[PDB]
Write a protein that binds this ligand. Structure first.
Ligand SMILES: CCN(CCN)c1cc(C)c(OCC(=O)N[C@@H](Cc2ccccc2)[C@H](O)C(=O)N2CSC(C)(C)[C@H]2C(=O)N[C@H]2c3ccccc3C[C@H]2O)c(C)c1
Ligand SMILES: C[C@H](CCC(=O)NCCC[N+](C)(C)CCCS(=O)(=O)[O-])[C@H]1CC[C@H]2[C@@H]3[C@H](O)C[C@@H]4C[C@H](O)CC[C@]4(C)[C@H]3C[C@H](O)[C@]12C
Ligand SMILES: C[C@H](CCC(=O)NCCC[N+](C)(C)CCCS(=O)(=O)[O-])[C@H]1CC[C@H]2[C@@H]3[C@H](O)C[C@@H]4C[C@H](O)CC[C@]4(C)[C@H]3C[C@H](O)[C@]12C
Length: 327
C-alpha cells in the first residue's frame, strides 16, 4: 500500500500532491470522492486564477499523448474548461498512463480557485460519474496488479495536531481504533449509504448519506435544518447560508447516524469552526441546508475528520471506524 500525506489548510480543507508528466511536474490536489475526473491548470491558461498555480506544460513531457477533445467540468462551486490530454500520472510511488483535463479557463471557478492553494482536483469517484468514461485511478491500478485491492482510505489531518494520509490498495489498523463497520452502497455511482439520521428529536429514517472528501460541511435537508435551528440561539450571516453561534452554546446538538451494523455520532466540536477574528467566543457551523430530490445528507470533511473511512470499489461499500486521535 502506498500513501499520500494530507496537509491541512485552515482546518476547512486538506490537500495532497501528485505528479502529471514524465518530468515530475508536481501539483497540489483537492482529493474528491464525489467527482471522477482529474484536472490540472495548463501553461495555456490565460486566467487570473492560473497566475498563482503550478501549471502543466505538455511540451516538456515526452510521455504526453494529445487528445484535444474539449470539455467543461461543472461543479456546484463553479466551472472549469479546457480539453483532454493523456500523460503519466503518479500517485505516491505508483503510476499509470491516464486521461485528464488540461484546464485553460478557471474564471467560472471563482472565488474558490484564487482563494485556495490547490492547483487541481483529483476525483476518486465511480466511472459512470466521470466525463469521458475514465476508469478510476484505483480501479486501474488494481487491474494492472500494482495494488492488492481496488480500495482507498482516508485518515484526515487534524489542524495543529497531526497530518493525514490517503492510502491506496489496503487498510492499516494504525489509522483507527475500535471496530471497522462496512456499509453497503445504495447507489451504483456515488459513495452513498443508507443511515437513519437523528438530531435531537428530529429524525429522518433511511436517509441517503454521501461520504464526501471534497465538501467542507455536513449538508442537511433544508426542512430538517430549519427544525434543528428553531430556538437554537444561532444567527444567519447576511447573504450567505452560514450560521454563527457562541462556541459554547449548550443547545448545539449531536448528529447520530445509525445502520443495522453501526452507529456514528458527530458532536459540536467536529462541526464548529472558530472565528475569534469576527468576534470573541464565536463559531461558524460547518452545516449547510441542501435539498436533493431524495432526502440526503453529505457527510463531508467534518465527519471524515472524526471517522477513518475506507472506500471499497470491489465490495461496493464504505468502511467506517473512529480515527486514531494521533499516530
Ligand atoms: C449526473 C451528472 N454528473 C455526471 C456528468 N457526466 C455529475 C458530475 C459531477 C462532477 C457531480 O458532482 C458535482 C459536484 O460539484 N460535486 C461535489 C459534491 C456535491 C456537493 C453538493 C451537492 C452535490 C454534490 C464535489 O464532490 C465537491 O465536493 N466539490 C466540487 S469542487 C470542490 C471544491 C472540490 C467541492 C466543493 O464544491 N466544495 C464546497 C462545498 C459543497 C457543498 C457544501 C459546502 C461546500 C464548501 C466547499 O467545501 C455530480 C453531482 C453529477
Ligand atoms: C449546491 C447548493 C444549491 C444550488 C442550487 O440550488 N441549485 C439549483 C438551483 C438552480 N441553479 C441556479 C443552480 C441553476 C442551474 C440548474 S438548473 O436545473 O436550474 O438548470 C449551493 C447553494 C449555496 C451554495 C454555497 C454558497 O454560495 C456559499 C459558498 C460559495 C462558494 O463560491 C462555493 C462554496 C459555497 C459554500 C456554496 C456551495 C454550493 O454551490 C451551494 C451549497
Ligand atoms: C452539473 C452539476 C449538477 C448535476 C446534478 C446537480 C444536483 C442534482 O440535480 C440534485 C440537486 C437538485 C437541486 O435542485 C439542487 C441541488 C442538487 C444537489 C444539484 C446541484 C447541481 O446543479 C448538480 C451537482
Amino acid at each position: 500500500n502506498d500513501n499520500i500525506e494530507l496537509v491541512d489548510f485552515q482546518n476547512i480543507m486538506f490537500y495532497g500532491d501528485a505528479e502529471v508528466g514524465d518530468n515530475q511536474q508536481p501539483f497540489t490536489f483537492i482529493l474528491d470522492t464525489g467527482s471522477a475526473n482529474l484536472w490540472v491548470p495548463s501553461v495555456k491558461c490565460t486566467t487570473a486564477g492560473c497566475l498563482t498555480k503550478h501549471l502543466y506544460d505538455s511540451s516538456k513531457s515526452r510521455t504526453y499523448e494529445k487528445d484535444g477533445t474539449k470539455v467543461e467540468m461543472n461543479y456546484v462551486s463553479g466551472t472549469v474548461s479546457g480539453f483532454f490530454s493523456k500523460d503519466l500520472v503518479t500517485v505516491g510511488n505508483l503510476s499509470l498512463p491516464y486521461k485528464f483535463i488540461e484546464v485553460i479557463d478557471t474564471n467560472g471557478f471563482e472565488p474558490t480557485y484564487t482563494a485556495s492553494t490547490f492547483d487541481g482536483i483529483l476525483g476518486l469517484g465511480w466511472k459512470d460519474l466521470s466525463i469521458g468514461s475514465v476508469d478510476p485511478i484505483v480501479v486501474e491500478l488494481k487491474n494492472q496488479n500494482k495494488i492488492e485491492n481496488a480500495l482507498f482510505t482516508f485518515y484526515l489531518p487534524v489542524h495543529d495536531k497531526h497530518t493525514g494520509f490517503l492510502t491506496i490498495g489496503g487498510i492499516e489498523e494504525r489509522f483507527y481504533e475500535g471496530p471497522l463497520t462496512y456499509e453497503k452502497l445504495n447507489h451504483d455511482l456515488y459513495w452513498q449509504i443508507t443511515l437513519d439520521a437523528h438530531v435531537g428529536n428530529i429524525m429522518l429514517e433511511k436517509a441517503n448519506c454521501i461520504v464526501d472528501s471534497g465538501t467542507s460541511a455536513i449538508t442537511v435537508p433544508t426542512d430538517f435544518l430549519n427544525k434543528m435551528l428553531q430556538n437554537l440561539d444561532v444567527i444567519k450571516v447576511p447573504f450567505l447560508p452560514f450560521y454563527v453561534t457562541l462556541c459554547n452554546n449548550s443547545k448545539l446538538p449531536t448528529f447520530e447516524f445509525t445502520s443495522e451494523n453501526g452507529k456514528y455520532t458527530l458532536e459540536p466540536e467536529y462541526y464548529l469552526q472558530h472565528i475569534e477574528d469576527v468576534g470573541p467566543g464565536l463559531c461558524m457551523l460547518n452545516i449547510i441546508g441542501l435539498d436533493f430530490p431524495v432526502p440526503t445528507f453529505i457527510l463531508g470533511d467534518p465527519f471524515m475528520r472524526k471517522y477513518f473511512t475506507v472506500f471499497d470499489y470491489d465490495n461496493q461499500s464504505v468502511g467506517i471506524a473512529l480515527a486514531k486521535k494521533n499516530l
